Amino acid sequence: HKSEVAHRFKDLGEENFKALVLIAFAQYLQQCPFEDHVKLVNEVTEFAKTCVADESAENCDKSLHTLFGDKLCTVATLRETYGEMADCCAKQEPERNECFLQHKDDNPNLPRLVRPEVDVMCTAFHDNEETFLKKYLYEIARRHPYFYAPELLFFAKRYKAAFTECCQAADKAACLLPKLDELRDEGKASSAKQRLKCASLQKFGERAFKAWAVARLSQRFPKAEFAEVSKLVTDLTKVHTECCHGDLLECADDRADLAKYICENQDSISSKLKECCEKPLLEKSHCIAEVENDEMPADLPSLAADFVESKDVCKNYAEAKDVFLGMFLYEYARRHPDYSVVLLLRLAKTYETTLEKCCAAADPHECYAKVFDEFKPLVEEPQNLIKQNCELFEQLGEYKFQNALLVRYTKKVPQVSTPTLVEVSRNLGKVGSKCCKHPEAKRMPCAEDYLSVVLNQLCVLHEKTPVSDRVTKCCTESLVNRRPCFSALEVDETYVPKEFNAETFTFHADICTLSEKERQIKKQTALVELVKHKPKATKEQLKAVMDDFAAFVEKCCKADDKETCFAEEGKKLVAASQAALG
Ligand SMILES: CCCCCCCCCCCCCCCC(=O)OC[C@H](O)COP(=O)(O)OCCN
Ligand SMILES: CCCCCCCCCCCCCC(=O)O
Ligand SMILES: CCCCCCCCCCCCCC(=O)O
Ligand SMILES: CCCCCCCCCCCCCC(=O)O
Numbered sequence: 259h260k261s262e263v264a265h266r267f268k269d270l271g272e273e274n275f276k277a278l279v280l281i282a283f284a285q286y287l288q289q290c291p292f293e294d295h296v297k298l299v300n301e302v303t304e305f306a307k308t309c310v311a312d313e314s315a316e317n318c319d320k321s322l323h324t325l326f327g328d329k330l331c332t333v334a335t336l337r338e339t340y341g342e343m344a345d346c347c348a349k350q351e352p353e354r355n356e357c358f359l360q361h362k363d364d365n366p367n368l369p370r371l372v373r374p375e376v377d378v379m380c381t382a383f384h385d386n387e388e389t390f391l392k393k394y395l396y397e398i399a400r401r402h403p404y405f406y407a408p409e410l411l412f413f414a415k416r417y418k419a420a421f422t423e424c425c426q427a428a429d430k431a432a433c434l435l436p437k438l439d440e441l442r443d444e445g446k447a448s449s450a451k452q453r454l455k456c457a458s459l460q461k462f463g464e465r466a467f468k469a470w471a472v473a474r475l476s477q478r479f480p481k482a483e484f485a486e487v488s489k490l491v492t493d494l495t496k497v498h499t500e501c502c503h504g505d506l507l508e509c510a511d512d513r514a515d516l517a518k519y520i521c522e523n524q525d526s527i528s529s530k531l532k533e534c535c536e537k538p539l540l541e542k543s544h545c546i547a548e549v550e551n552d553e554m555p556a557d558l559p560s561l562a563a564d565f566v567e568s569k570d571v572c573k574n575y576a577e578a579k580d581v582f583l584g585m586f587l588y589e590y591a592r593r594h595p596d597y598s599v600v601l602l603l604r605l606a607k608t609y610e611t612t613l614e615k616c617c618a619a620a621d622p623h624e625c626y627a628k629v630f631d632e633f634k635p636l637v638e639e640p641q642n643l644i645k646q647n648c649e650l651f652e653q654l655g656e657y658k659f660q661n662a663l664l665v666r667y668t669k670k671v672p673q674v675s676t677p678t679l680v681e682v683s684r685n686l687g688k689v690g691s692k693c694c695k696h697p698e699a700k701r702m703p704c705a706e707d708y709l710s711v712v713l714n715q716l717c718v719l720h721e722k723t724p725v726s727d728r729v730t731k732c733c734t735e736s737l738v739n740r741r742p743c744f745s746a747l748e749v750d751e752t753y754v755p756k757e758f759n760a761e762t763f764t765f766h767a768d769i770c771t772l773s774e775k776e777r778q779i780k781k782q783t784a785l786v787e788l789v790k791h792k793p794k795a796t797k798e799q800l801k802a803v804m805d806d807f808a809a810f811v812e813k814c815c816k817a818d819d820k821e822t823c824f825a826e827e828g829k830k831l832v833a834a835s836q837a838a839l840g
Contacts, residue, residue: 261318263325264309269539274411276303280392281407282506284399286330286358288366289339292396302329322507323355330358359504362403371397376434380425391418398445405449407506408540413445447711454714456502458737465580466737467495472584473591473602477703479528480554480592484585486526493519517543528552551595561589565609566629572617583610596699597637598706603738604636643745644701648694657778660687664782665800668789670747673725676786678716680779685712709741755793762787763832766824770815781807792839803835 259265267275279299287295302325309318317325330336330347337344346357373379382390395414402410420441424433459467471491479487493516501509520527521535521542530552534545565571565586575582587606594602609629616626651659663683667674689712693704717733724730732743763784769777788803789795795803810831814823 261309261313262322263306263318263320264313266322267306267310272303274540275306277395277411277414278407279303280395281399281410282326283330284396285403285405285407286362287333287340288363288400288403290333290335292393295396296392298329321351324351327351327354327358355505362504364404366400366403368401371401373438376431379434380421380430383421383425387418402449404452404504406452406501406509408510408544409448411540412544413441416441450711450714454710455498459498459502462737464495464499467498468492469584469587469603469606470599471495472587473599473606476588476591477595477597477599478549478551480595481529481552482527484588486523487588488584490520490527513543514539517546520546554592554595558593561586562630564589566627569623572613572622575613575617596702598640598702600706600738600741601637601640601702605633607738608632608636639742640702644693644705647690648701651690651694656687656691659690660684661782661785663687664785665789665797667747668786669749669793671726671729672750672753672790672793674720674729675723675725676783676790678719679786680782682712682716684779684782685715706741713740713744753793756787756790758791758836760832763828763835765811765828767815767821769811795839799839803839806831806835
């Protein structure tokens, strides 16, 4: 429902409601000063209370969309600030909302948000928590207009845990900054993931999306029957599709509905969901989405019977090609939660290709009798990659490992700028750090998931400023070859090595007052300019120059002077190196 606003107020709570109204408005009106959206949020909140007291009350019968757009159209400066979005107001609902939806700016071109010093922040926090927290909720929201709002609220609450804990600890910066650094990471990864969820849907289409989802849901709910996994992916895809159009209210209802359906049918889905079905609306769906894998049914048969030995394989396949392949993929996925989703799609795509050849022939059982042999190599290639890389990592350590990567890729694609090489190799390094600590079981899902963050940003940066056809190839290619494409880059032996330049390999005393990290980005940048300039540098020729530079600093920051050792012994490093790397 009779009143939809009353119903969200009741269901969300007051604080949560005030929060999501702020985020809603911050994401359309991305230029009205904070101390001004607050006026709005209180006005919308005051109205909500009246509708809650009496659901007959004026304007309460209206739809969320209508109230929301009606409110957008009240702001005095709309036409001067936002220009042709004010043009949307001269329409009726539903068109008016489609019009508003289509005029959000993804790059609102604001100044970078600058983290104040820890003590400034903590003083601000204590002196007024509500205001400190909302001002920041406003600053993220208008920079990330497409970030599903309930997710922002969840980070919001984690920023508030980090402050309360750390702003009364012995050493606050030691407490606070890693927490803030992990939040930046996670915040950014999630933002990356959503834009890649949609992009994939638009380029590669719905069937590919469903394939991905069947794999993922079958690893997560491996006691569910194929019929229920399939029902869940049908609705799972409908919601992503709706959540990509970009309309918060519609997207949120579908998510609500799905969590609703999942909790009613727990018995038929998974035993690991009782914890999250007792949670309140706002959180239910976020939770289910991060739910841990249910233990798999004990002692299932192999697939051989249904997918190889059976005599009904071409008949079943021909009758409904995509339900069959989807069942193969369901029976595979639930058996192996230790596989990355993309491995499964590669396996499933291979089983597909042989059936098209082998069903088209006239001894089909004979032709495709050996199809499981082909899975072995594809399964083992990711496994080894993880093995060689996690045995390298634990014997070099994060930083040195980051540096093993830096020279590997600079030699492979030496036309990528030095900053992009530094950032990808540093993050790749961190993915190594993060998934090697896992047992072998949960490693591959781990790495798939962090690589796709690290490699998508690669493409996005390279998208606008491209300097390699091979990188471009790996980026536009299929989502099941993004990774192996890159893994196939060889050394660029056409490379014309960069001319020398004194400036880059000059260093000063400030480097000693640089922070652990800051110093590393510096050291690592020189390392890329060194490989660009001497690509044919044997590892050991480079190992020894890195050890010359290593002494050149320490035995020079620990010396009784100066600049000068920096100028005059740096003079003697450049000369020596040029000679030994020749
Ligand atoms: C569902 C996409 C990937 C999730 C991986 C595993 C799925 C597990 C199955 C539980 C179903 C999920 C329950 C509700 C549906 C659900 O959580 O997602 C619905 C759409 O992804 C909407 O995306 P958006 O709202 O922008 O994402 C929020 C996080 N950034
Ligand atoms: C429940 C039916 C959903 C569709 C399942 C069909 C699976 C298609 C197998 C081929 C894999 C292609 C991989 C891809 O497109 O990235
Ligand atoms: C650079 C991080 C250290 C170890 C991880 C290397 C990644 C190799 C496996 C990629 C996992 C995704 C599965 C796949 O592409 O099939
Ligand atoms: C041809 C001029 C050579 C001088 C430039 C040397 C650049 C090497 C960067 C050192 C990275 C090592 C990091 C470390 O081990 O702490």
